[PDB]
Design an enzyme around this catalytic site. Structure first.
Site, mmCIF file in Angstrom:
data_model
loop_
_atom_site.group_PDB
_atom_site.id
_atom_site.type_symbol
_atom_site.label_atom_id
_atom_site.label_comp_id
_atom_site.label_asym_id
_atom_site.label_seq_id
_atom_site.Cartn_x
_atom_site.Cartn_y
_atom_site.Cartn_z
ATOM 1 N N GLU A 1 -4.480 -9.064 -0.422
ATOM 2 C CA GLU A 1 -5.326 -8.941 0.788
ATOM 3 C C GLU A 1 -6.779 -8.712 0.367
ATOM 4 O O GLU A 1 -7.081 -7.960 -0.560
ATOM 5 C CB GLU A 1 -4.935 -7.763 1.685
ATOM 6 C CG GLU A 1 -3.620 -7.842 2.433
ATOM 7 C CD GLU A 1 -3.348 -6.618 3.244
ATOM 8 O OE1 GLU A 1 -4.350 -5.953 3.690
ATOM 9 O OE2 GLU A 1 -2.163 -6.339 3.545
ATOM 10 N N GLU B 1 0.772 -1.222 0.000
ATOM 11 C CA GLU B 1 0.000 0.000 0.000
ATOM 12 C C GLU B 1 0.815 1.290 0.000
ATOM 13 O O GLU B 1 0.571 2.168 0.806
ATOM 14 C CB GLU B 1 -1.035 -0.033 1.083
ATOM 15 C CG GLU B 1 -1.994 -1.200 0.962
ATOM 16 C CD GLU B 1 -3.114 -1.276 1.992
ATOM 17 O OE1 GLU B 1 -3.067 -0.592 3.050
ATOM 18 O OE2 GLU B 1 -4.070 -2.109 1.748
HETATM 19 O O1 LIG Z 1 -9.727 7.764 10.509
HETATM 20 C C1 LIG Z 1 -9.463 8.722 9.542
HETATM 21 C C2 LIG Z 1 -8.082 8.469 9.003
HETATM 22 O O2 LIG Z 1 -8.011 7.366 8.104
HETATM 23 C C3 LIG Z 1 -6.650 6.974 7.851
HETATM 24 O O3 LIG Z 1 -6.754 5.752 7.116
HETATM 25 C C4 LIG Z 1 -7.521 4.655 7.730
HETATM 26 C C5 LIG Z 1 -9.020 4.583 7.243
HETATM 27 O O4 LIG Z 1 -9.657 4.130 5.991
HETATM 28 C C6 LIG Z 1 -9.518 4.631 4.638
HETATM 29 C C7 LIG Z 1 -10.669 4.063 3.800
HETATM 30 O O5 LIG Z 1 -11.474 5.251 3.697
HETATM 31 C C8 LIG Z 1 -12.719 5.014 3.163
HETATM 32 O O6 LIG Z 1 -13.557 6.296 3.295
HETATM 33 C C9 LIG Z 1 -12.012 4.463 1.898
HETATM 34 O O7 LIG Z 1 -13.027 4.517 1.009
HETATM 35 C C10 LIG Z 1 -11.495 2.991 1.833
HETATM 36 O O8 LIG Z 1 -11.328 2.542 0.492
HETATM 37 C C11 LIG Z 1 -10.245 3.081 2.679
HETATM 38 O O9 LIG Z 1 -9.914 2.156 3.668
HETATM 39 C C12 LIG Z 1 -8.605 1.530 3.602
HETATM 40 O O10 LIG Z 1 -8.875 0.586 2.714
HETATM 41 C C13 LIG Z 1 -7.727 -0.351 2.321
HETATM 42 C C14 LIG Z 1 -7.979 -1.278 1.193
HETATM 43 O O11 LIG Z 1 -8.265 -0.714 -0.061
HETATM 44 C C15 LIG Z 1 -7.165 -1.328 3.432
HETATM 45 O O12 LIG Z 1 -6.003 -2.310 3.407
HETATM 46 C C16 LIG Z 1 -6.983 -0.323 4.519
HETATM 47 O O13 LIG Z 1 -6.832 -0.976 5.756
HETATM 48 C C17 LIG Z 1 -8.218 0.579 4.678
HETATM 49 O O14 LIG Z 1 -7.794 1.478 5.591
HETATM 50 O O15 LIG Z 1 -9.554 3.582 8.170
HETATM 51 C C18 LIG Z 1 -9.056 2.249 7.993
HETATM 52 C C19 LIG Z 1 -7.528 2.165 8.167
HETATM 53 O O16 LIG Z 1 -7.151 0.836 7.659
HETATM 54 C C20 LIG Z 1 -6.754 3.335 7.498
HETATM 55 O O17 LIG Z 1 -5.360 3.432 7.935
HETATM 56 C C21 LIG Z 1 -5.883 8.095 7.086
HETATM 57 O O18 LIG Z 1 -4.482 7.997 6.872
HETATM 58 C C22 LIG Z 1 -6.018 9.283 8.059
HETATM 59 O O19 LIG Z 1 -5.207 10.371 7.690
HETATM 60 C C23 LIG Z 1 -7.493 9.659 8.257
HETATM 61 O O20 LIG Z 1 -8.137 9.891 7.011
#
Ligand SMILES: OC[C@H]1O[C@@H](O[C@H]2[C@@H](OC[C@H]3O[C@@H](O)[C@H](O)[C@@H](O)[C@@H]3O[C@@H]3O[C@H](CO)[C@@H](O)[C@H](O)[C@H]3O)OC[C@@H](O)[C@@H]2O)[C@H](O)[C@@H](O)[C@H]1O
Ligand SMILES: [Mg+2]
Length: 340
Positions: free
Chosen positions: A271, A149
């Protein structure tokens, strides 16, 4: 002719990630990083249990950052490299297909600023030269996935495939990774190397910008927890699966087909999975629709398993590692028996 890579991947039933383990970032420069997020130390028996259930391929995510010496050598601490090799060897002992990645480098040095391309490329190559040297003699069942990622955390387009300049940088980084590994020779001359898009994103603009290496021994990794509102907990999320949102899976997969599969480029979903929401029957139906979609073109996937099921956090757990029993045998059966 990329058919060697297709032949290797065709041996996989379905895969399984050793999540929140070697990828965990606590403990500093210590082997104790492995247990820093609450998982037990991995054993031969844990890996055996995965294999025995039908997951004959394992992804071993690893975060190296805190185990690295200073730039420019970025020497991997010997104890950490030894432990990584022990875990890979659990899988080798069982004749498994294996993916070794770099993982949460993105919390540390792997921040996709296009102005920092040289330092980024050089660090990635330095780590991969060492990994490739260490695993040089391992057979073709071991595959390397250069990045996980890769992105600029906190940026507007973090989760939508980044910006065009970032996607150019991803292409440069993929090349750096391949070059570093091939330059070590041995079985690394033709090992499957698994490159990725920005964020492992599969939106049309992200795939349109992905450079495909001329190296015939590559594959492209994506992460497709689709649809997000079923698989994750968020404002708008749901736990029911009746088929009505299968179009989300289909539309995205048709882009993967247009840009990769129908051009003869190997694709691996490194994944996916669905968080447990007291919704066993719905998850079973979703796996049918989701894995069934992949099976049309013999695309393989690896399920994310973090050992979280009964407690708080993202409930992707499948294997209760301490008990060597599965948390939910109906969900697991749907995965391992996907092709029946
Ligand atoms: O909490 C706010 C915070 O988010 C930080 O990232 C995390 C966040 O999800 C991002 C997702 O947002 C949805 O609105 C997206 O549409 C969706 O596609 C995306 O989620 C991520 O999706 C990945 C797969 O495609 C997956 O492996 C990943 O785990 C998933 O996150 O909540 C979920 C966490 O996993 C993220 O780290 C962001 O950096 C931060 O600054 C703020 O926006
Ligand atoms: Mg050879």
């Amino acid at each position: 002719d990329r058919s060697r890579v297709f032949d290797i991947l065709s041996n996989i039933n379905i895969g399984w990630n050793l999540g929140n383990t070697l990828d965990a970032t606590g403990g500093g420069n210590s082997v104790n990083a492995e247990t820093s997020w609450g998982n037990p130390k991995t054993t031969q028996e844990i890996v055996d249990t995965v294999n025995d259930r039908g997951f004959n391929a394992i992804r071993i995510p690893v975060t190296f950052a805190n185990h690295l010496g200073p730039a420019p050598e970025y020497t991997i601490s010997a104890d950490w490299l030894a432990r990584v090799k022990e875990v890979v060897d659990y899988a080798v002992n069982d004749g498994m297909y294996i993916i070794l990645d770099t993982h949460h480098e993105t919390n540390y040095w792997l921040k996709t600023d296009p102005n920092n391309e040289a330092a980024l490329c050089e660090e990635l190559a330095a780590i991969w030269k060492q990994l490739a040297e260490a695993f040089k003699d391992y057979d073709e069942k071991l595959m390397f996935e250069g990045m996980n990622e890769p992105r600029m955390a906190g940026s507007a387009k973090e989760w939508s495939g980044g910006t065009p300049a970032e996607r150019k940088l991803i292409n440069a980084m993929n090349k750096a990774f391949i070059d570093a590994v091939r330059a070590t020779g041995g079985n690394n001359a033709d090992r499957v190397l698994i490159i990725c898009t920005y964020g492992h994103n599969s939106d049309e603009p992200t795939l349109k910008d992905l450079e495909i290496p001329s190296d015939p021994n590559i594959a492209v990794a994506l992460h497709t927890y689709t649809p997000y509102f079923f698989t994750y907990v968020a404002d708008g999320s749901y736990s029911v699966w009746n088929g009505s949102k299968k179009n989300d899976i289909t539309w995205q997969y048709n882009n993967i087909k247009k840009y990769l599969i129908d051009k003869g480029i190997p694709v691996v979903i490194t994944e996916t999975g669905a968080q447990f929401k007291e919704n066993t029957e719905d998850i079973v139906r979703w796996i049918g629709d989701y894995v069934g979609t992949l099976d049309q073109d013999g695309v393989k996937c690896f399920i994310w398993d973090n050992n979280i099921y009964h407690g708080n956090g993202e409930k992707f757990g499948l294997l209760n590692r301490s008990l060597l029993k599965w948390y939910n045998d109906d969900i697991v059966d749907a995965y391992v028996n996907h092709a029946a």
